[PDB]
Amino acid sequence: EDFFSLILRSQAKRMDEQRVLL
Amino acid sequence: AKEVKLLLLGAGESGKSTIVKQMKIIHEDGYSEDECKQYKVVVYSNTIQSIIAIIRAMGRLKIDFGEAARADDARQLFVLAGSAEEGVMTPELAGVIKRLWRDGGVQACFSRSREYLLNDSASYYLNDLDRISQSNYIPTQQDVLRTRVKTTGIVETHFTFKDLYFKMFDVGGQRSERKKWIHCFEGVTAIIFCVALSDYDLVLAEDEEMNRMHESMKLFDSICNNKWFTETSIILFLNKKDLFEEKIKRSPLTICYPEYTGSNTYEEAAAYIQCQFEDLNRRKDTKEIYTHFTCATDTKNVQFVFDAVTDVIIKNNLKE
Ligand SMILES: Nc1nc2c(ncn2[C@@H]2O[C@H](COP(=O)(O)OP(=O)(O)O)[C@@H](O)[C@H]2O)c(=O)[nH]1
């Protein structure tokens, strides 16, 4: 299905230069 | 023991981490004054990050400042970028941001955020600059909600509500721990798919083969129709309705769906989008979708929507 990949790719695209570690 | 497992899914920036935080506020007594203090630095950092993101975008989008003097502040911002990594935002730094956020050129660039990637906590923090720049400042719970944090794994939260044990997982973008990751997809009562409605007008980026909304659709299409999920509630959170409503006044939905012949009312568009998603469900006899229009940053709204989601779960196992 390549189903898990598609999710992995999608949810990772989330503006990381604009988030911060805790 | 009737125990409930909830899996949050959706493109990055759809509101998943917010929903998680929101359960902590609504069902787990929120954040103690200690915890709020810990997000002080995060608030400062995100504010710095947000204003930088606009500044850098001005160079690319070829937008001059309103007043030529701000060039110095731009240079000053990068120098001071680290100042807040402990505690205070110096007064000097606050003025830099204050004066930049005021500027007409910066604003034009902020209006044009569909043309690049500007986070939706930006204006929340920047419009409250005066408040957060006070040395004594302790982040409010609404401030904590608005924090943007990098996670590197599975996010989990658990609570008891209406005599039921809830476990909620925001599986991240990291399969850097498979098995535990795959498990999040197993034995799920309800999947909550989030969609940023306000993405409808985002320019087709250079790294995309279709716009963000259709990417969200393709994703929903595959989740919804996966044989593994036959006995799992599909719940749709069409999120960021606050932003969607403002945008749709100005940007036609045809930007996202060329074939759309309706009108650019919040009501008619939101209904069109819902249909576009719900039509993806290819087993309509054996499955129904539970659509909700949410503003995830609005605690009161989420409480209500989640309350309703729970009521369906209760009425579910009283049948099956
Ligand atoms: N204005 C507005 N902002 C939102 C809404 N939902 C989320 N946000 C903000 O949008 C960004 C993405 O939210 P987040 O939960 O981090 O998305 P995730 O990437 O799916 O975890 C964050 O800055 C949130 O605080 C909403 O309904 N309205």
CATH of the domain at B188: 3.40.50.300
Q: Are residues B10 and B143 in the same domain?
A: no
Nearest CA to ligand 1 atom 12: B13
A14 is in an annotated binding site: yes
Query: Is residue A9 part of an annotated ligand binding site?
Result: no
Residues B116 and B181 in one domain: no
Q: Which residue, by CA, sits nearest to atom 28 of ligand 1?
A: B240
Answer yes or no: do B237 and B281 share one domain. Answer: yes
Query: Searching chain B, which residue's CA lies closest to the CA of residue A17?
Result: B49
Using the 3D structure, point to which of B150, B182, B214 is the last residue of a domain.
B150
Contact between chains at B49 and A21 (C-beta distance less than 8 A): no
Of B11, B38, B45, the CB nearest to A13: B11
Amino acid in the structure at residue B254: T
**CATH number of the domain encompassing residue B77:** 1.10.400.10
Domain end position, chosen among B150, B185, B204: B150
DSSP codes joined into one string, A1-22: --HHHHHHHHHH-S-GGG-B--
Q: After which residues are there C–N gaps above 2.5 Å in chain A?
A: none
CA–CA distance, B276 with B268 (Å, rounded to integer): 13
Residues B136, B159, single domain; the answer is no
C-alpha distances in angstroms, B32 versus B21, B140, B141, B317?
13, 10, 9, 35
User: H helices of chain B, where?
Assistant: 16-27, 33-38, 40-61, 70-80, 91-102, 104-111, 122-126, 129-132, 141-145, 180-183, 212-224, 241-250, 266-278, 299-317
Q: Are B297 and B315 members of one domain?
A: yes
Q: Give the Cα-Cα-Cα angle B297, B16, B296 (nearest 5 degrees).
A: 20
Tell me: do B188 and B293 sit in the same domain: yes
The resolution of the experimental structure, rounded to one decimal in Å, is: 2.9
CB B281 within 8 A of CB B289: yes
Alpha-carbon span A13 to B208, nearest angstrom: 11
Distance in Å from the first CA to the final CA of chain B: 15
In this structure, are B213 and B269 located in the same domain? yes
Interface test with A, best of B43, B86, B117, B225 (most A CBs within 10 A): B117
Nearest Cα to B109, choosing from B81, B79, B74, B78? Answer: B74
Domain identity same for B118 and B86: yes
Residue B53 · residue B119 · CB < 8 Å:
yes
Provide the domain limits for residue B303.
Answer: 1-31+151-320
Q: How far apart are CA B35 and CA B241, in angstroms?
A: 29
Which of B150, B177, B198 represents a domain boundary (last residue)?
B150
Same domain, B235 and B255: yes
Q: Are A13 and B12 within 8 A, CB to CB? A: yes
Do B63 and B101 lie in one domain? The reply is yes
Whether residue B264 sits in one domain with residue B168: yes
Contacts of B287 (CB under 8 A, 6+ apart): B224, B230, B234, B281
Q: Tell me: do B13 and B43 sit in the same domain.
A: no
- What is the number of domains present in chain B? 2
Chain A with chain B: Cβ pairs closer than 8 A: 77
